[PDB]
Every structure is written in C-alpha cells, then in structure tokens.
C-alpha cells in the first residue's frame with residue numbers, strides 16, 4: 001500500500017519527491033512528468049510503483065540537474081525541484097510545514113536566491129537530520145535518500 | 155522479504171570489499187558467524203534494508219553501522235570468520251587472487267597492492283571504487299563502507 005511510505009517520505013525523501021508522494025496520496029493520480037520522477041526514484045530505492053497504486057519490492061533515476069533543468073512544471077504538475085521551481089513565499093511555507101526553524105529557513109532562502117539549489121537541499125538535509133556538516137556533495141535525489149538512511153538507521 | 159540472491163548483483167556493483175565478501179560467504183555457506191552477521195547485518199541496516207534468518211531474507215526497514223576504522227582496527231577475523239577489511243586482513247597473495255577474480259586489471263592490481271603495502275587500506279579501497287566505476291577519481295575520502303555504497307549508487311545513477 002502506497003501509504004506504507006508516508007513516514008519514510010517525511011523523514012528521508014528530498015523535497016522534490018516528498019511532494020510527489022504527498023500529491024499521489026491526495027489526488028490518487030499523477031501526470032506523466034511526475035510519474036517518471038517519483039516512479040524512478042522509488043525504483044532507485046528498491047521498490048516498485050504500480051497502479052489504486054501499490055508498492056512492492058522489485059530505468060535510470062533522475063538527477064538533480066535533470067530535474068532542475070528539463071521540463072518545468074505547469075499547474076496540475078507536481079514534479080520538478082522545489083528549490084528552483086517553487087515560488088519563494090510558498091517555499092517558506094513548505095519549509096514551515098516541515099518544522100524547520102526560521103534560522104535555517106533564512107539561510108536556505110539565501111541559497112535559493114543565489115541559485116544554489118543543491119546546497120540549499122544540502123542545508124535542508126542538515127536541518128532535518130540535525131547535522132552541522134552533511135558530508136557529501138549532492139547531485140541526485142537517490143543520494144539524498146541513502147545519505148539520509150545512513151543517519152537514521154545509525 | 156525478498157530472497158538474498160535478489161541483491162546478488164548489487165553486491166558486485168556497489169558493495170565494498172568487506173561487504174561483497176560477506177555476501178558471498180552467506181550465500182555460499184548459509185550462515186555467518188557473529189562478526190560477519192554484525193558487520194554485514196548492520197551495513198544492510200544502514201541501507202535501510204533488514205536481513206532476517208527465518209532461509210535468509212531481507213526487506214525494507216520502513217547498534218551502529220561499522221566504520222572503516224572500526225572494522226579495520228577492531229575485531230580481526232579468525233579462520234571461521236569471513237569479516238573485517240580485506241585490504242587489511244587478507245594476505246596479499248589471496249587478495250591478489252581475489253582481486254583478479256573480480257575482474258580488475260594488472261594495472262589496478264598493481265596499484266592497489268602498493269597501497270596495501272603502504273598500509274593505506276582505505277585508499278586501497280578507493281582504487282577499487284574507481285576501477286569498478288571506470289572513474290579517474292572517486293571524489294571523496296572514504297570512511298564508511300556505507301558511504302562507499304551511496305557514492306557508488308550515485309554513479310550508476312548518473
């Protein structure tokens with residue numbers, strides 16, 4: 001059942017995925033663009049997404065620069081990266097729904113405006129995971145996943 | 155819980171030499187001893203998977219995973235054991251046959267060995283990473299088998 005990963009997406013998914021997850025639950029559907037981003041991200045974590053959707057243990061996953069550059073999202077479309085594609089004022093609100101302190105939120109917000117999205121994600125990661133220095137140069141959402149899974153089951 | 159051979163290929167692809175080695179032995183002998191269960195069991199947990207011995211199974215997860223230094227400087231392997239760092243705990247003659255078995259070329263085997271000679275086992279392992287991914291430079295400083303994992307997955311990813 002798709003819902004089995006609610007908490008997993010909260011805790012360890014990137015913003016770009018966690019949104020697609022939230023979306024899928026709430027609209028019981030996804031357009032093309034967002035089926036491939038979240039579907040192949042799931043693949044990347046050893047899990048399959050199939051249609052009334054379900055997940056089961058088991059095609060190149062999407063990179064933060066494939067997401068950031070190609071195919072920006074129309075309305076209805078819930079795919080793309082929120083550091084880049086989200087409008088800032090709403091971005092502050094999403095960061096706010098995630099219980100991220102204003103300090104971080106500010107810092108991040110500076111990075112977005114610097115067009116430093118991946119470093120912003122990086123900052124975020126530090127914040128949800130409570131680490132001062134994350135330790136890895138981020139370029140792929142599957143890397144966000146395992147770099148998170150490490151801290152959690154650590 | 156899928157079956158273990160379900161990640162038989164992933165171990166060649168993305169597990170370090172200490173984990174790839176524990177996989178073999180678990181699939182081959184059907185058991186592992188303590189230090190090999192813990193090393194291998196905890197590494198997998200670090201991935202978010204969970205090995206179980208009902209017949210061995212692994213599933214998703216939805217004790218602290220061992221560092222390179224933990225493994226290398228603590229709990230050396232007895233004969234009944236298949237754990238620890240290979241670059242550190244293997245005779246180099248056997249490492250040399252193990253590394254051949256994994257399809258690394260002479261130039262790779264040569265460099266790796268020199269490093270082992272210098273007692274630079276972790277860098278001996280970066281050589282392995284780069285060789286397996288056909289990269290000129292791994293990019294990071296290695297500290298954790300689990301970091302080797304994620305870094306590797308990231309290459310195969312793109």
Ligand code: SF4
Pocket residue numbers: 014015016017063064065067068080081082083084117118121122139140141144
């Ligand atoms: S940065 Fe890369 S990973 Fe972090 S959210 Fe934007 S896309 Fe997903």
Ligand code: SF4
Pocket residue numbers: 170171172173221222225226238239240241242275276279280297298299302
């Ligand atoms: S170096 Fe760290 S990773 Fe490479 S083998 Fe020895 S322990 Fe496993």
